[PDB]
RNA sequence: AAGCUCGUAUCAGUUUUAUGAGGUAAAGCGAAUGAUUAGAGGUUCCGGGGUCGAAAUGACCUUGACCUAUUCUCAAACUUUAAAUAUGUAAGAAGUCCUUGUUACUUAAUUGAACGUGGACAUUUGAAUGAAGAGCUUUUAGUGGGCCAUUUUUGGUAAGC
RNA sequence: GAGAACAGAAAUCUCCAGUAGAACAAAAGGGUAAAAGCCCCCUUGAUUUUGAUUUUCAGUGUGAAUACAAACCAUGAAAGU
RNA sequence: GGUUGCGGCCAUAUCUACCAGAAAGCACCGUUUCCCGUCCGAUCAACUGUAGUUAAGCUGGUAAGAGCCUGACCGAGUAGUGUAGUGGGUGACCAUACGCGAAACUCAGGUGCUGCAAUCU
RNA sequence: GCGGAUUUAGCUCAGUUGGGAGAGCGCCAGACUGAAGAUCUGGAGGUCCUGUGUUCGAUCCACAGAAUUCGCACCA
RNA sequence: CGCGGGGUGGAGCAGCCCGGUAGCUCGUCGGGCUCAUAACCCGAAGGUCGUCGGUUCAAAUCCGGCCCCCGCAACCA
RNA sequence: AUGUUU
């Protein structure tokens, strides 16, 4: 009994946080460009602390945001890697959820040593219709409490759809 | 040898011996800092007013 | 050595606390301000006695520590460690300065006199007004003489005049004893720690129902 | 509730609320100050804004001056008045914005007695030009464009309304680099593309493409056009006739206002909750307290 | 060394009236100042341009010039044993219309009306203000107001 | 000192009325910042340790480190608030009101701005008190080591510092 | 604060809360939230002429600053700046 | 009286938690050829007003609500302070006389008002 | 008391630009020797003089001290 | 300000004095000889010539600015 | 050419 409080995928962000900025970074950018079908964005480092050799504004990561049916397809493809089993702790309090895969080459294109191996980070942001209220320029507002996404709502939606399951508390 | 540095002692008495005089307001005050565009137009307006008043004294 | 307290008895300077602009203040001699049975409930100690200043002056942290030690030791010896709760209600936040002038023959030769005389931190003192409470001690009504004598002993450690006053309040609360009794029998007082919380007729009814089940 | 919701008493006490229309996300006061602030050496001259606002399903085009008591509308035009001039569909598109700007310009000139002089651009061809002052005559009515919070983009319907108001005879200072048809790679505008957008050429071309393509989309979109038997090639003459009728009679015939304001007020007053009095609040508090005869 | 800058000792003078920070409301810019208008000077700390010197905070003067965003104000400054004419170029955010003469203008209109009605009805004007006069005789009744006798209270501590 | 122009008179180390400005005294810290005392309840997912736990924080003992509601005491270089004294301006004819002339300024526009012509209003011409009058000018002496008293106040233990 | 492979207590990605508790070259104070902060785009008003004004003040100088005028520009859709 | 565009004062307007909303309006909402902008039509742009919904925004109500606002022979004429004495007191400081006069606290009330224009069961 | 300096593994020291705690002599272990010394390899060794704050972190950017010392301390 | 000279492997120098092109010694490492060490013998590694720009069928070199070091000489706001 | 002790 809910007209348009239908939880749906707003976006899926694929992330490759490489420890360096060498050719591996370009290869990772090409990797997450291939399945996304969009030009990715380079993420510069903000500090130079320790243990990574990363420097201020070194372009150490690369990410891409996918929306709509392409995002849903990529989400299902990365879910088949995790065998449709995600931990409960994988679900955030605000109703989004994520997971990490390694050895991405097990789907789509093969090893291709010109490209190499990268694990990738999936994060899915979940909301309802009317999320524009918080993002539009004019009359920007806050989504009401009953319309906000919760971790329980996202867990229930994620087990209803994909016929998946969650794990221990 | 050190000496005194500053004091306002007796200064008000000195000022009030000849008094604090208000600055003698005049009608038609000076147009020193008035906007020069306004002043330029005011000159022509006053010239036209003077000529009109002279011509109209028949 | 330490200068005599007569040199810093009076509030001659503006308050000069340890701050961003001092950074070099020695530690106060008194570090403990609550002693005795400081965990006792408000119901346990109805009788409150105050050692109150009758002068505008400065009490050194050394004198505060000496008087606290004297009063606590006397009342502990006579009535027991847990027969009272003594609270020092003045904190030595004002820093005293000293312009150190080396004492020896020929000091004028290697001294600048009054040039650059601004002093270094010498100690700490509490600035008390007339009628300001210095010591508060709550206890049972039977321990009145012991408590009064303890504060009388502590008074010898302070400069100036101090008065022993029996408070009309219940313990360390701001309520006169009949009013506290009425509130307690009406159930609008809940023990929180060594102090109590009072039920107000304002705020959320759900919270005023949860706390203070006086309904 | 949450450890970050239900902010603390100190935070609430020290919170300074923005201006109400800034909290509502409606007024950009930084821009409004510069739009409204008059040269002090005029001492009464209002600065008229051509306020153009786009809601869903409607376009608001107002001419507004500022006072201490509040803003005062000199003339207002809406895109829901375009059916009177022969536009019944696409009431928020570029051509509707142009028509509304032309209507507000003509209505304001008629109100100010400046309609015969400053006829504007009667033969619109998409050429960039401002309403010039006539020689030895009153200067054209000058208004300044007020987008509001809408973003300045090359092709915006807000600049379509600007173009329509400028063509209507109002002097609205503007450049041509925000009109549809401006080539960002160079410094010239495309007058044919601007005229096409003025007369709905982009919408007609979309209609033709959708008809020559999958008909389900052309049946869902433009459904009212089919039900009104309006062809894509008819849009240019529809908007030309609308411009002619606007120039012919921009006199703001208002709605007949059935259900007079008093019965409107009564009907709305039926469906409104009233504030409980202090006696009722105390009664509810006493009832809630007496509910705990024991403890629930 | 000593420090006397342009904005020296203005730390609290030029503050923003706690919980009234941010943008200046539009009535300040919609105010109209004519030459001869009397204005009070109060610097707005958020507008750093056209700002008056700290000496003129709280000073009341007369507009002598009107520019695009500012007015010229005439202030008589006490220098030594006399007053010197100072001309300040102040943006409108730092001034407001003075109400030191609104009461005078309303009294002027009321006096004109009273004089006209006097010369229409009879002969009585009394158009000058008068200081608060001594109270006239009055009779104070005890009906329901019988005097209650008070006494000084004895000393007690209640601490 | 010399005076000069006037003297229906002008103004004032003062009050009153009206209207501003200030951030000191006080006050406040269950209000921001910085200090500061104590207990209480939640945080074992509190940082955890002891001890088991075959081991996990899992069961406890519990040192904390936070959060919540309280609590004692403070600030020249803290503050929501905020005096008293002191302080700016105004209390009219150089005013008010009505009509309309100039402009190359300004307005969409005789629109506004400023300066005007003409007309009307003297018992209190628009608070109090006072006024060996007011205003103005020139030219010159000496002085340019200060000190004391009440009150506010800085350094200093203090000083006839 | 809650979430994601390596990746932990600091890397990158996401959401929520967040009156400024950040940042604005430097000392401190004031000021600033669709900004004065961060990023991006275009630029040279850090230009010309000579006056007026505020502070310091003798109402001198110097420094600094304010508001105009007469030009030429920059920017923006524009008001403006 | 509701709603919208522009607003004035800028919390009596804010914040938290629930509830309700007829009509219209607003809104969410549907699409990507065109102008335009993005990693992503999410934002921004354009198109449709059609496919749907009041779920959210928004509005209003509720709450011994937080905050905020107002008032008080509430605290308190208290603190402080101008003026006075060959007043008290070793002093610290204090009292008195003629005046001005808080803040905290407590209690009570309140929770946007309003301008222009348009529109509405 | 003033004006300065330095403080780093047991010893001498290098850091230092918002690098990163390191090198010799010591010690240990293994080589070599019949066995020593000498050499030759490898390793450990500091919570950078103490405490508090500002930085994304910190000897190093960065406050109050503590220790060790050098120069001056004069005219009667 | 002026005139000059110098900067080259970790260190000290040549090659520069007109482009045919980076070398000598010490130092480091590996091996060889010796019972072992030094000398000795054979290898390897080490600058691309103080920083940029300029002219050259292909410049450390020739030219012009600039950084550091030294000598001499000069000095009205 | 040199190679220290027992
Ligand atoms: K004593
Ligand atoms: Mg002397
Ligand atoms: Mg002297
Ligand atoms: Mg002192
Ligand atoms: Mg001597
Ligand atoms: Mg803007
Ligand atoms: Mg202030
Ligand atoms: Mg500036
Ligand atoms: Mg001050
Ligand atoms: Mg104080
Ligand atoms: Mg002399
Ligand atoms: Mg901006
Ligand atoms: Mg200077
Ligand atoms: Mg969309
Ligand atoms: Mg849009
Ligand atoms: Mg609803
Ligand atoms: Mg409340
Ligand atoms: Mg006397
Ligand atoms: Mg032997």
Curated annotation (Swiss-Prot), chain A:
State its location(s): Cytoplasm; Nucleus
Q: What is its main location?
A: cytoplasm
The record's GO CC annotations read:
cytosol; cytosolic large ribosomal subunit; nucleus
Residue ranges of the TM segments: none
Cited Pfam families: Ribosomal_L5 (PF00281), Ribosomal_L5_C (PF00673)
One of the GO biological process terms: translation
- Assigned keywords, A-Z: Acetylation, Cytoplasm, Methylation, Nucleus, Ribonucleoprotein, Ribosomal protein, RNA-binding, rRNA-binding
Alphabetical list of PROSITE patterns matching this protein: RIBOSOMAL_L5
Modified residues annotated as N6,N6,N6-trimethyllysine in this record: 70
Q: Output the InterPro entries linked to this UniProt entry.
A: Ribosomal_uL5, Ribosomal_uL5_C, Ribosomal_uL5_CS, Ribosomal_uL5_dom_sf, Ribosomal_uL5_N
MF annotations from Gene Ontology: RNA binding; rRNA binding; structural constituent of ribosome
**Subunit structure of this chain's protein:** Component of the large ribosomal subunit (LSU). Mature yeast ribosomes consist of a small (40S) and a large (60S) subunit. The 40S small subunit contains 1 molecule of ribosomal RNA (18S rRNA) and 33 different proteins (encoded by 57 genes). The large 60S subunit contains 3 rRNA molecules (25S, 5.8S and 5S rRNA) and 46 different proteins (encoded by 81 genes). Component of a hexameric 5S RNP precursor complex, composed of 5S RNA, RRS1, RPF2, RPL5, RPL11A/RPL11B and SYO1; this complex acts as a precursor for ribosome assembly.
Miscellaneous notes: Present with 39000 molecules/cell in log phase SD medium. There are 2 genes for uL5 in yeast.
Designated name of the protein? Large ribosomal subunit protein uL5A
In which organism is this protein found?
Saccharomyces cerevisiae (strain ATCC 204508 / S288c) (Baker's yeast)
Curated annotation (Swiss-Prot), chain B:
* Compositional bias annotation for Basic residues: 1-25
Keyword Ubl conjugation assigned to the entry: answer is yes
Q: What are the boundaries of the region Disordered?
A: 1-36
Location of this chain's protein in the cell: Cytoplasm
Cross-link Glycyl lysine isopeptide (Lys-Gly) (interchain with G-Cter in ubiquitin) residue location(s): 51
Q: Which UniProt keywords apply?
A: Cytoplasm, Isopeptide bond, Ribonucleoprotein, Ribosomal protein, Ubl conjugation
Disulfide bridge map: none
What does the record list as GO biological process?
A: cytoplasmic translation
Q: Which residues form a coiled coil?
A: none
Its primary localisation, in coarse terms, equals cytoplasm
Q: One GO cellular component from the entry?
A: cytosolic large ribosomal subunit
Q: A Gene Ontology molecular-function term?
A: structural constituent of ribosome
- Give the source's domain of life in one word: Eukaryota
As for what it does, the entry says: Component of the ribosome, a large ribonucleoprotein complex responsible for the synthesis of proteins in the cell. The small ribosomal subunit (SSU) binds messenger RNAs (mRNAs) and translates the encoded message by selecting cognate aminoacyl-transfer RNA (tRNA) molecules. The large subunit (LSU) contains the ribosomal catalytic site termed the peptidyl transferase center (PTC), which catalyzes the formation of peptide bonds, thereby polymerizing the amino acids delivered by tRNAs into a polypeptide chain.
Quote additional remarks: Present with 51100 molecules/cell in log phase SD medium.
Task: Tell me its family.
Answer: Belongs to the eukaryotic ribosomal protein eL29 family.
What is the protein's quaternary organization?
Component of the large ribosomal subunit (LSU). Mature yeast ribosomes consist of a small (40S) and a large (60S) subunit. The 40S small subunit contains 1 molecule of ribosomal RNA (18S rRNA) and 33 different proteins (encoded by 57 genes). The large 60S subunit contains 3 rRNA molecules (25S, 5.8S and 5S rRNA) and 46 different proteins (encoded by 81 genes).
Which PANTHER family does its entry note?
A: 60S RIBOSOMAL PROTEIN L29 (PTHR12884:SF0)
Swiss-Prot record, chain C:
Q: What are the Phosphoserine sites (modified residues) in this protein? A: 142, 204
> Where are sequence repeat segments found?
166-180, 199-215
* Gene3D superfamilies for the chain: 3.30.60.300, Ribosomal protein L10e/L16
Single annotated GO MF:
structural constituent of ribosome
Cross-link (Glycyl lysine isopeptide (Lys-Gly) (interchain with G-Cter in ubiquitin)) at residue(s)? 39, 100
Consequence of mutating residue 193 to D? Answer: In QSR1-1; synthetic lethal
Q: Which Pfam families does the entry link to?
A: Ribosomal_L16 (PF00252)
Q: Name one GO cellular component term.
A: cytosolic large ribosomal subunit
Q: Which UniProt keywords apply?
A: Cytoplasm, Isopeptide bond, Phosphoprotein, Repeat, Ribonucleoprotein, Ribosomal protein, Ubl conjugation
User: Which stretches does the entry tag as region 2 X 15-17 AA approximate repeats?
Assistant: 166-215
Give its localization. Cytoplasm
**Has UniProt tagged this entry with the keyword Manganese?**
no
According to its UniProt entry, one GO biological process term is: translation
- CDD domains named among the record's database cross-references: Ribosomal_L16_L10e
Principal localization reads cytoplasm
The record's family statement is: Belongs to the universal ribosomal protein uL16 family.
Sum up the protein's function in the record's words: Component of the ribosome, a large ribonucleoprotein complex responsible for the synthesis of proteins in the cell. The small ribosomal subunit (SSU) binds messenger RNAs (mRNAs) and translates the encoded message by selecting cognate aminoacyl-transfer RNA (tRNA) molecules. The large subunit (LSU) contains the ribosomal catalytic site termed the peptidyl transferase center (PTC), which catalyzes the formation of peptide bonds, thereby polymerizing the amino acids delivered by tRNAs into a polypeptide chain.
Q: What is this protein called?
A: Large ribosomal subunit protein uL16
What species is this protein from? Saccharomyces cerevisiae (strain ATCC 204508 / S288c)
UniProtKB/Swiss-Prot annotation, chain E:
Localization, per the record, is: Cytoplasm
Q: Quote the Pfam families the UniProt record gives.
A: Ribosomal_L21e
Under the heading PROSITE patterns, the entry gives: RIBOSOMAL_L21E (PS01171)
CC per GO annotation:
cytosol; cytosolic large ribosomal subunit
Question: What molecular function terms (GO) are annotated for this protein?
Answer: structural constituent of ribosome
Keywords (A to Z) from UniProt: Cytoplasm, Isopeptide bond, Ribonucleoprotein, Ribosomal protein, Ubl conjugation
Glycyl lysine isopeptide (Lys-Gly) (interchain with G-Cter in ubiquitin) crosslink location in chain: 31
What processes in GO biological process is this protein linked to?
cytoplasmic translation
At the top level, the lineage of the source is Eukaryota
Against SUPFAM superfamilies, the record matches this protein to: Translation proteins SH3-like domain
| Stated role | Component of the ribosome, a large ribonucleoprotein complex responsible for the synthesis of proteins in the cell. The small ribosomal subunit (SSU) binds messenger RNAs (mRNAs) and translates the encoded message by selecting cognate aminoacyl-transfer RNA (tRNA) molecules. The large subunit (LSU) contains the ribosomal catalytic site termed the peptidyl transferase center (PTC), which catalyzes the formation of peptide bonds, thereby polymerizing the amino acids delivered by tRNAs into a polypeptide chain.
Subunit-structure text: Component of the large ribosomal subunit (LSU). Mature yeast ribosomes consist of a small (40S) and a large (60S) subunit. The 40S small subunit contains 1 molecule of ribosomal RNA (18S rRNA) and 33 different proteins (encoded by 57 genes). The large 60S subunit contains 3 rRNA molecules (25S, 5.8S and 5S rRNA) and 46 different proteins (encoded by 81 genes).
Additional remarks: There are 2 genes for eL21 in yeast.
Q: Which family does it belong to?
A: Belongs to the eukaryotic ribosomal protein eL21 family.
